[PDB]
């Protein structure tokens, strides 16, 4: 063990970090009167409707 | 492992961020008297109406 022939010193490290995410949303509020355009074979009603507004520019 | 022939050091990164949205709205308030211009085959009434105002310039 003379002349520092056995001394030793070492270090080491390692790291990792990952992450992620996502989201989505939507809302809707109002009232609209539609019209029946077809009566299906089991009594259900197919309905369609449209409302058009024009306030001063568009 | 002499002469730093095995030392090592590395880094790395990565990032991403996206987003978006939209919205719409409309209101309307008032009173207007319209006139029946047709009676449909099931009793419904087709109505039309117009009101014209002219306050001092337009």
From Swiss-Prot, chains A, B:
It is found in: Cell outer membrane; Bacterial flagellum basal body. It comes from the Bacteria. The basal body constitutes a major portion of the flagellar organelle and consists of four rings (L,P,S, and M) mounted on a central rod. Belongs to the FlgH family. Assembles around the rod to form the L-ring and probably protects the motor/basal body from shearing forces during rotation. This is Flagellar L-ring protein. The chain holds residues 117 to 174 of 232 of the full protein.
